[PDB]
Amino acid sequence: YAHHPIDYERSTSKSPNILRLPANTSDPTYQENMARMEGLVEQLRARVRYVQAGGVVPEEEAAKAGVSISSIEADDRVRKLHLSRGKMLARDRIERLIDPGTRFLELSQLAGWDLYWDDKKKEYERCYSGGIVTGIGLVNGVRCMLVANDATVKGGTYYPITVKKHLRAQKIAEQNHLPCIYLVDSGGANLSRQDDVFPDEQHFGRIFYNEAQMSIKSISQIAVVMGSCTAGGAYVPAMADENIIVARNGTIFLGGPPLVLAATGEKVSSEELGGADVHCRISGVGDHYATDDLHALYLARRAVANLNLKEHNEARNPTDVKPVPPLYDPRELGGFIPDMLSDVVKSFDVRAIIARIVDGSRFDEFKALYGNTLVCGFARIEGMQVGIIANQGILYSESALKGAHFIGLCTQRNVPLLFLQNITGFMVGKKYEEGGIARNGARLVMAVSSAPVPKVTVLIGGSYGAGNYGMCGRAFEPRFLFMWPNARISVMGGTQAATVLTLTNRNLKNASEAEIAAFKDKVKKKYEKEGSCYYSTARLWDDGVIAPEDTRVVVAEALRATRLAP
Amino acid sequence: LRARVRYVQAGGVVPEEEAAKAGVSISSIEADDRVRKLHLSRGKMLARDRIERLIDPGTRFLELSQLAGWDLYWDDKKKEYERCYSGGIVTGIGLVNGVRCMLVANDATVKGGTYYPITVKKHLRAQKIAEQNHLPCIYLVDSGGANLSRQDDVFPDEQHFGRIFYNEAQMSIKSIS
Amino acid sequence: YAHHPIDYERSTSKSPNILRLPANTSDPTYQENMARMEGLVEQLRARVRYVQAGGVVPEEEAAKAGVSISSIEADDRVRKLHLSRGKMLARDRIERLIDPGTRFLELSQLAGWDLYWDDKKKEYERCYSGGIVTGIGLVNGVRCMLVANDATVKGGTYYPITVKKHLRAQKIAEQNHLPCIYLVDSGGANLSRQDDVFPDEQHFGRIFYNEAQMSIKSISQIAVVMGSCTAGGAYVPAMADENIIVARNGTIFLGGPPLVLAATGEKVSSEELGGADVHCRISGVGDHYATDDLHALYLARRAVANLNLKEHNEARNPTDVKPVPPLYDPRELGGFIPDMLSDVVKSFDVRAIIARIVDGSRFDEFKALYGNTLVCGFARIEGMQVGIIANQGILYSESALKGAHFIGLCTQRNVPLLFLQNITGFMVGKKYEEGGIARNGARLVMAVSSAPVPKVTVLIGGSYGAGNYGMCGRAFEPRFLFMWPNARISVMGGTQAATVLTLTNRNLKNASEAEIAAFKDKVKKKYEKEGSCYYSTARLWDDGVIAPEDTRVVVAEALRATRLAP
Numbered sequence A, C: 001y002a003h004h005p006i007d008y009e010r011s012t013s014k015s016p017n018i019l020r021l022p023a024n025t026s027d028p029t030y031q032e033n034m035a036r037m038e039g040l041v042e043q044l045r046a047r048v049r050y051v052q053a054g055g056v057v058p059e060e061e062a063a064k065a066g067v068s069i070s071s072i073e074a075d076d077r078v079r080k081l082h083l084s085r086g087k088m089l090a091r092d093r094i095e096r097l098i099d100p101g102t103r104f105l106e107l108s109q110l111a112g113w114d115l116y117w118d119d120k121k122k123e124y125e126r127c128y129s130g131g132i133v134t135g136i137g138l139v140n141g142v143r144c145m146l147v148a149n150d151a152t153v154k155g156g157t158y159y160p161i162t163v164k165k166h167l168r169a170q171k172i173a174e175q176n177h178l179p180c181i182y183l184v185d186s187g188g189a190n191l192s193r194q195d196d197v198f199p200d201e202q203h204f205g206r207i208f209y210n211e212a213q214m215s216i217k218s219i220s221q222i223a224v225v226m227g228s229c230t231a232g233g234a235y236v237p238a239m240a241d242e243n244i245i246v247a248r249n250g251t252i253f254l255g256g257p258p259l260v261l262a263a264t265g266e267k268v269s270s271e272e273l274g275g276a277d278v279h280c281r282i283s284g285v286g287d288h289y290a291t292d293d294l295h296a297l298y299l300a301r302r303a304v305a306n307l308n309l310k311e312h313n314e315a316r317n318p319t320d321v322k323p324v325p326p327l328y329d330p331r332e333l334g335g336f337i338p339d340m341l342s343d344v345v346k347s348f349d350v351r352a353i354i355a356r357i358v359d360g361s362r363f364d365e366f367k368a369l370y371g372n373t374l375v376c377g378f379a380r381i382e383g384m385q386v387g388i389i390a391n392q393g394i395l396y397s398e399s400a401l402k403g404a405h406f407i408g409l410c411t412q413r414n415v416p417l418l419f420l421q422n423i424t425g426f427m428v429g430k431k432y433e434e435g436g437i438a439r440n441g442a443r444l445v446m447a448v449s450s451a452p453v454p455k456v457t458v459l460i461g462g463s464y465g466a467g468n469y470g471m472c473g474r475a476f477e478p479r480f481l482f483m484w485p486n487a488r489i490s491v492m493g494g495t496q497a498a499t500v501l502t503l504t505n506r507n508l509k510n511a512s513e514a515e516i517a518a519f520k521d522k523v524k525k526k527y528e529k530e531g532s533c534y535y536s537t538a539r540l541w542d543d544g545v546i547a548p549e550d551t552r553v554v555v556a557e558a559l560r561a562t563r564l565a566p
Numbered sequence B: 001l002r003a004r005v006r007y008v009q010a011g012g013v014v015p016e017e018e019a020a021k022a023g024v025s026i027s028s029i030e031a032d033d034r035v036r037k038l039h040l041s042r043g044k045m046l047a048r049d050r051i052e053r054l055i056d057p058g059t060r061f062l063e064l065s066q067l068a069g070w071d072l073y074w075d076d077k078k079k080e081y082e083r084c085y086s087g088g089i090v091t092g093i094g095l096v097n098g099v100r101c102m103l104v105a106n107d108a109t110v111k112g113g114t115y116y117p118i119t120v121k122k123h124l125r126a127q128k129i130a131e132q133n134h135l136p137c138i139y140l141v142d143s144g145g146a147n148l149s150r151q152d153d154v155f156p157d158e159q160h161f162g163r164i165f166y167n168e169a170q171m172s173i174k175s176i177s
């Protein structure tokens, strides 16, 4: 009918239905939300600074961070003493190591935030980081995993949060075939929590297991020995394609200098006990002997160069690309996010978020009239086709079917998946249970777990209960996890668990007010005591923590990380 | 050769009425024009137009099988053959959005019945070609159901209407969407 | 509760629930059914005899077969003339070729039964067979496909039913890796239906295509040239690992003896034109030159011996096994089958049939309370575990789901499948259509076609319409098909098509009786004019035709045929 184009015009124009046009009006509601978000990011963006240069914050105005006041002078004294030795006490080794003008990720940050409670009731162990810093680094045109042991040995070298971080880094590198670089500085072991860190599985032995399984798959790895690595820490220099020992302060020992005493205590110099022995000794241990920190870092870079990965990365990830920005300003991402601590769940939207994040502000909807709860479709993220699952409302059987169908197509055509978690939302109606809802949930989870597609999840907010099993979860092998500040990970019910567990717990009929004070308030305190900031990341649950505004850059880092894969 | 093509194209409606270069018998042009008018009033394009709308401009096309079912069946009327201007479908290789694809379109000719022993064979030939060459298929579906007259010839046995369903699953096994 | 066994006793006893105890009472209803069956088998079992020794039935009492009287004297004269030549005119070559005490199948029989209508109105072409005889034969401990060209050349060598039979045999052999043996006697081609048999595809060229594709897969094939094979028939002796030419009457030609005349007509002896030339000619054509029929058959057997397949077959199919019979008498199979030509569908059962066929009369039911329409479960057939799908009633969505689940398990564990076809039975209710019944039917057909498991189907009765797409059909690659006498293969409706097509066909409101006489009676005649005996097998639709009583033996032949497969 008076309409005869050739699909384009209708396409390739600034007027295709594919795009999205949710324009906000900045009203009170927007302000209430936008403002809060701002109230939910300032310190997130801040604590980072405090742990960075940990314990030395000369401004002394860090009231925006709820961190307790710490003895700045002690940390400054320790840093001065350490830097007088001739080694750089910072993450400086990293940004010296990575090529200028390139990107970085800082995979796990704020690790071990106020984790352990000391004997002093008001004092926690001052683990500003997990004892290491981990991030994806691009060296000499080669993408690599960077792990650096921090010089914080006051509490002890490695904790249940340190070895877990190291093992997570090793698993990520092995999955993605990114070579690792380890910067080694250790105080040995922790002889206090040794039962928690040494024996059992997924412990310090699995590091040695991984450093051999990698070299089986011919994924070369490199370690730099800046200081002592004793107590089983001396095997990494031994199990290494290339290793670096600094001329003066680089030391490697299987038995400590105190250990020779009380067992043939003919004590001699710490150099002769296994440290950097530049005298043409009989031992052929340690590939590189470098006179200075810069010399060692330079030789590490030079060894990284001769791996032939530059051609493969350059072919797989195009270095010269034209950035395509979204149609709407990314600062608006905080506004559509609702507020917090609201008796009844507030309202929420997804279209706006996806239209703000994706390229050209576009989307490819599958069936949206049907199973209106769940959202699935294709997209574009900086030159790469992506699939997104974002959740909105209370799940039905049909939503599970649609999810299974989408995941089937994505696995069929080798399209990566992105997850945006939300509430559990399993209806409890009797008719729904009689309609085989459990079978359809199984249909969804089977497809989720069976998918060989790389998978990344990011918390939008309100991910509580067994609903994440429908979409995705840490136990379903997501190659990366990141989080927004307004996240709560809890039991099958965030608010309802309060009501349900109020009924069935040794309660007399009378004393109703005192009981709800003792029951409902207490369970609310329990189920929102956990949050994005503490229960997560600090314990390497969903290790990555980010800002809602800069999500697309992070996801693009992740996707470039997962295309060197076999 | 170059001409009959034109006649089956816009089949049965040749306003020039000078198609003596084609030995085709004179057909009731008014009936076909009436049918096409009624069909286009419905809101759907009665032609191969769906195809050249679907394929990118400036690109090529093949029209794999043409003149299909040319004067094939002899009707009860001795001087009349069944007016199957095409095989009931049109098949050609099409390049869509930079992607080469097989295009199969069911014609709206349902006067004789949807599918014949020449229609299912054309569809199956297209499916075999696509599977051999790993070109994805696009089917434009318009049907009058089945043909309950030659049903023994088209429904049972092998290489029939079931093999279409067989191929549409064997393709998705090989991940050829 | 006072019950503490160890599973057996409860098991390994003559009282396990696994078995089945449907005992008949031989009542009128049984008689009506049992008797009819008997009325449905006598001639089935008989025509076989008539085509066997075709056209020569000395009893002349073959009134039990509706076959028209034929000139017996002419056929006897032809057979006498042919046997005077020195070659055995019968299937005798086969049972001479196969080891004594072994089995045989006769894959396609009654082929080309009264197919073509001649110029004479009351006369059909006398193709007692398809011109060939095909059956699975076990030679020298090696299972092989046997194809023998009958000496019936009165109508012409090969027909649209002959080449289809040959190609079906070749496809079966290639799928099952059974070597073929061809017994070649030809009158050349048929220059009357040549357009129907020579050009196009799936024709005489595909025989030559298959005889080369087999030798690519190293599946050796053997041909015996008893008489002339001209008109493209001379390539099979040329395309053969081993070929046999009889000393006197074995001839091979690319150009006929009449063909030399009118084109340099220097006629010479038919021996010199390409026949058996035992004079040490320059041609190295034809491996074996045998003085007698027995000598040629013996050399064929000797060549078959040196293939090394005996060890592989003996390992795969155990030669020394203990037969386990069912608990109930197989003669009762005809009784549970209802009668025929009944206005409204009669009643039917399945349990009894499966309990009569399987080993030990046992079964392994999946969910039978749910989707009570369709039947699926495991079984035992002569030492081999089997899966059976037998249909009973009108299909639902849940029946399709159960079928898909069963086929999934069977493919997962590599269990063969058996099909017992029945009515279409797709409900037309609006609520059922609104419940996504089409999606569930697609779910079923997808699993049916995708299954790599060997598949065999046998017609129980009433297989009409698109319902077979749910279970299985010829277009879904069943490696064998067999049929019972009471079978009807028709449009989506056997009885209802009459009612529906009565309404919508140029009918005036009045003249109702004359119209139903002209409409309903006519469509009934059309939709039951087709049947098991004519429309099937004779046209190689479901090529195998059997008796209901001897089904388990046939299915056991089929399963042993499908374990030499790769």
Ligand SMILES: O=CCCCC[C@@H]1SC[C@@H]2NC(=O)N[C@@H]21
Residues within 6 Å of the ligand: A394, A424, A425, A426, A427, A428, A492, A493, A495, A496, A497
């Ligand atoms: O429309 C009313 C039904 C609401 C169901 C909410 C589901 S039921 C289980 C889960 N726990 C909750 O508190 N909400 C979800």
Ligand SMILES: O=CCCCC[C@@H]1SC[C@@H]2NC(=O)N[C@@H]21
Residues within 6 Å of the ligand: C394, C424, C425, C426, C427, C428, C492, C493, C494, C495, C496, C497
């Ligand atoms: O109970 C009433 C429903 C009857 C369904 C009859 C089924 S629907 C498809 C098939 N075609 C027929 O003519 N009858 C069956």
